[PDB]
């Protein structure tokens with residue numbers, strides 16, 4: 001909704017949609033990190049906290065993104081950074097400002113130092 | 115002051131001390147000191163292996179916090195010479211939780227940035243338990259820029275509980291300062307090497323740890339969050355810290371397989387604290403080896419390699 | 431609130447005000463307002479020339495401090511559009527004694543940095559009488575770097591009594607911040623234009639005034655030290671300020687001959703305060719003309735010319 | 747705020763870590779309400795990129 005609100009209509013193009021969590025730390029909390037991963041993914045309808053959608057602003061190309069705080073506190077998971085890199089790379093290859101919105105409670109603990 | 119599980123080592127040490135007194139205490143007492151010293155040292159050496167063979171991640175964390183250990187000052191003294199300490203951010207204060215300076219390594223000049231918990235209570239409170247307010251990280255950025263400018267390599271030590279969680283620290287752009295630090299260090303035209311001596315992590319540690327190479331002792335924990343914090347938030351308790359430590363993967367070998375750190379520097383038995391000189395020598399050898407195979411690459415190739423390695427972060 | 435020597439102008443104004451009331455006050459009073467208004471305005475217009483013809487340097491200083499005048503906010507409003515105010519040094523605070531922002535000048539985008547004394551007592555104390563603590567100058571450096579990065583020209587207004595002489599200002603590297611400001615501004619790859627609207631000087635003013643061109647109103651004083659300070663130190667008194675003003679050469683035409691400033695923008699009669707719109711138009715025309723003959727030169731030639739002009743400073 | 751509360755074991759200032767407070771303390775540029783946001787970004791970016799101003 002945020003991305004649609006900012007970007008113009010009909011020019012939206014999602015980026016990094018094939019990137020999904022691939023937990024390897026098998027983090028065993030009170031719940032299993034895979035449990036929370038799947039629960040958030042189905043509850044919010046998004047693979048991870050961050051969404052990226054190339055678009056246009058008043059006829060000017062631009063790249064936007066935002067955090068879905070509902071996703072495990074919107075933590076910056078591996079996919080979050082990977083999509084961030086994807087968006088920045090898109091902005092670099094095609095000359096266009098890049099914008100983002102911040103909403104998170106901290107880095108994704110379950111992935112530890114990753 | 116040895117830890118709780120180092121007790122058998124202690125009592126044997128406690129018998130050992132009064133051997134000096136019995137040498138010349140009183141009543142003509144000068145016993146055959148050498149025989150008893152040799153036997154008790156033999157037993158103590160045998161027992162430490164009986165004690166440090168069976169330690170795991172929760173212990174490793176305790177050892178990483180042994181209140182008798184070399185801090186960055188100690189490694190500087192025992193592996194560096196002609197050390198000049200630059201103190202001052204140029205903005206609001208110099209911080210005692212970070213100590214930086216310019217020194218020589220086997221003739222070669224280097225920059226040394228790292229934390230200093232202070233030894234006893236007094237130097238611990240004077241240095242804020244190695245917890246840096248942001249002005250410290252601004253100072254570290256300033257020094258790192260200076261080192262970059264004059265074609266000088268950077269050696270960084272990392273031993274911090276974390277960025278200070280206080281009113282003064284938050285007011286002055288803590289997040290902003292650390293963000294800038296993480297931005298500049300990823301563009302310097304000089305090689306960067308960063309150890310994980312002692313206890314470090316919690317992000318603020320990364321402010322001076324983004325380099326070509328990364329190294330860690332065998333009893334040093336590098337956790338995005340202290341085990342106690344992870345326990346409180348997730349386990350809903352504090353006593354369950356060891357489970358958090360086991361799960362997170364804060365121990366060096368666990369991290370080593372993760373392609374996160376480039377080498378582990380083995381410790382003297384019983385912890386580096388028992389032989390600080392040996393640990394300093396090992397660290398100096400590792401640092402020199404790291405610098406050697408690094409100087410071959412040119413500055414542009416150095417930065418390109420640094421960027422590429424960063425991108426390898428995360429399974430994605 | 432007109433100055434002491436603007437009294438004859440005042441009393442004539444004082445008769446003029448109640449003309450509005452007499453128009454519809456009471457008792458059917460609606461007199462032939464137009465005739466009296468025309469005659470009194472004629473007399474007032476004639477008298478101001480009788481008053482502002484014979485003012486000299488001590489007065490100029492008083493007029494430069496007229497407590498009814500356009501500050502940088504006023505010139506922004508009356509000559510700039512689409513103004514966006516960026517507040518924040520990123521370190522410790524944003525300062526109210528400096529206001530910066532990014533706006534458009536006749537379509538063209540520009541950066542505007544300058545001071546704001548505040549109009550009345552409340553906005554004067556909230557902005558510290560246009561006296562900037564160093565964090566303000568760090569903010570100004572940050573904005574100037576931003577403007578340089580995106581091939582954007584910089585327009586700067588200068589209206590400051592001086593850098594704040596206070597504990598907080600000295601503690602935070604006042605000297606250091608101003609030194610850095612004076613260093614960076616002399617390397618930007620974008621043209622720089624700087625007026626001297628209002629009262630400015632005392633070095634701290636120079637923090638945002640090192641550019642390709644310099645311009646000053648006809649009643650604006652630019653003194654390395656306020657006249658009162660020079661009087662106290664040298665004359666051994668304060669009352670002898672006018673002599674200090676006469677000696678120093680703080681008036682625009684006196685400075686103009688010194689090759690220090692590139693143009694004087696003429697004022698509306700009686701001071702720019704009587705016709706702020708006319709002054710804003712004159713300033714906008716001068717700024718546009720300055721930018722025009724400046725954009726022809728390339729960035730490298732721009733910086734070379736800037737450096738060469740600096741070296742012309744001082745008779746040596 | 748919980749971590750800082752336990753650490754400093756005191757009362758945090760009112761408005762702690764609030765945008766109306768972190769613009770007071772220099773870390774925050776400008777406070778924009780959501781409805782303007784798209785125009786505010788559009789105008790600022792059209793300026794910085796040096797493009798002609800957007801049409802309302």
Ligand SMILES: CC(=O)SCCNC(=O)CCNC(=O)[C@H](O)C(C)(C)COP(=O)(O)OP(=O)(O)OC[C@H]1O[C@@H](n2cnc3c(N)ncnc32)[C@H](O)[C@@H]1OP(=O)(O)O
Nearest residue numbers: 071072073074075104105106107108109110338339747749
């Ligand atoms: C060290 C780090 O970087 S992570 C440490 C945790 N974060 C912090 O210390 C910073 C802020 N701390 C917080 O508790 C919050 O983010 C606050 C202060 C903004 C409060 O926001 P709240 O409205 O309380 O949100 P809350 O913390 O409940 O977040 C919602 C959910 O996200 C989860 N979450 C948030 N951040 C994280 C994180 N970094 N890792 C894992 N889960 C997280 C919470 O567990 C919670 O899950 P639950 O509702 O199913 O129990």
